Amino acid sequence: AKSKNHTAHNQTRKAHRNGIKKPKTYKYPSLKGVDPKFRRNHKHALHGTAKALAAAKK
Amino acid sequence: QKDAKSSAYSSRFQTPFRRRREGKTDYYQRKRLVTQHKAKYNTPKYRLVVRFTNKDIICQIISSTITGDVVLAAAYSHELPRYGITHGLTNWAAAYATGLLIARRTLQKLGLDETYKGVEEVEGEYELTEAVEDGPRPFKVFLDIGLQRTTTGARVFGALKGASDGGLYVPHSENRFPGWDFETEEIDPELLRSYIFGGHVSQYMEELADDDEERFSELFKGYLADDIDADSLEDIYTSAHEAIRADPAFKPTEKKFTKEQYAAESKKYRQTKLSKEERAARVAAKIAALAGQQ
């Protein structure tokens, strides 16, 4: 005994109630899936430069 | 010839790039030579474009750009006379010399000439310019043949040897030089040294100097004119190398009839095209002629 199979009725409205909102950016984003090379280097660079701006405070 | 390409054919013809239409560039090769690791972001991939006319060699260091290719340095075979090579300027020795010239020229104008002194003790041995620890890296450059065929025994590789011996790190294998026994897989440095300093030519000169001298006269007439025998060639090319290693620069020519003079008289033979009134006038005249039931 058959039965309706598919539709998208009302779903847009359901979403838009409390819906879509927004992808919610932030400053200082991730390093997911970035080149592990240059990850590996940027680490050493930050280590050195933090050492530098630290030693510059005596 | 009746093959009349119709409007539809012409309408759905896709033209190739201009350089392919001419027949001078393989863009296949060009992509795989120019594409740079994008994580270097502007590091130009310098290519040694080597071209062989029937009466001139063209060796140039080239980079690419959206606007057009850009030349860092260039070297031609008609310039070797300023180092002392007048005759035989499409041969293996002049190829070697042109490679040495462009090589020494680049590092001189770049400031590296103190280091990367190359071999300078030529014995025809395969060897690359190693990197100076506690110092800069050697200059990397990739040979662009173009449409020329890769075969073993070719004069492009004389130029390659010259560039490598001049101080550039030019990546290459030894399996397309002459004297490379293939079943052995081994190079013959003495033969290469001969092909650098004109041994096969000089041997041939002696060989025609006892086989047939009419031919030796007709081909080697410039040598005969300038009082040149076979065995002077090694010393000649050595002195040329020495002058090159001394001053490889690009002193240009002096250009009697300068730019505007050339434009003014050396090119005033072209017919400029008509104007719209002129086309209409020609058509009017043509109908005035063609008006007859013939």
Partner: protein, 159 residues
Amino acid sequence: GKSHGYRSRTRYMFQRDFRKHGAVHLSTYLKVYKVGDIVDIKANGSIQKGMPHKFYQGKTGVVYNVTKSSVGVIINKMVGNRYLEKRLNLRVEHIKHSKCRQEFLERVKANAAKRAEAKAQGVAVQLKRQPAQPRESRIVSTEGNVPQTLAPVPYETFI
């Protein structure tokens, strides 16, 4: 049965820019993409490697990573009632910069110049974008441009 493959419903989309088949020109490969750069996606059927899914055709995202032949792109995709952050890895043949920021930056430079001039002169800047206003009170004249009177024309058969 049904068909929901990767390149489904992609007849004309990755069909090719008529009378532009052929090996791709090299400005594509000479372009340079740094991190923080906005790029529009337009696939190429001639380059089957590095391809995007059809969903990302015509979208515009920001680069998060760069490799030998490809770049990594951040997109935001609408899924139901939320946006999800997607990371594509595309060869660069399918990619080109976005002229929108070029326009914004031109406006920025112009605003800076105008502000410096007004700061120099002690006068006003007013350098936001205002909309299209209607129109002031104009005056035409009938000198030579006399009114040509018109009327409808009747029905005639133009078959």
